[PDB]
Design a protein around this nucleic acid. Sequence first.
DNA 1: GGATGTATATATCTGACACGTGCCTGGAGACTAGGGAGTAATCCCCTTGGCGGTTAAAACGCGGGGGACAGCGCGTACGTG
Length: 50
Amino acid sequence: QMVRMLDILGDYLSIKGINFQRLDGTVPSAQRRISIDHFNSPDSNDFVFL
DNA sequence: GGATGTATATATCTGACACGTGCCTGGAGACTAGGGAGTAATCCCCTTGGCGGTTAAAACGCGGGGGACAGCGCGTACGTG
């Protein structure tokens, strides 16, 4: 529900070292479509989507 | 032998203090009423965290030219006696 908790988990997976992608209200629709197509690709190395 | 600087004693000024006195204004005691504290209900406004979309305002870069500022002359108006 909070994007600051999304920032907390994003930094947790960043120092943890897990390929993560993110979507919230600050992200414009072009990068949203880019992240959705990147997560749904068959050769995606992304593991967790926020 | 005459004239001069310092030292203790007495009279006078001068603000402060002890005493006197009035009186009036503040304090002690009692009573009362009402102003304010507390409670409950109802409804509207504000808080914190989010989202979406428009779009006009804000930010940034760059040319250039208008204006701020420094320097110099002068003559007159103000300082000074």
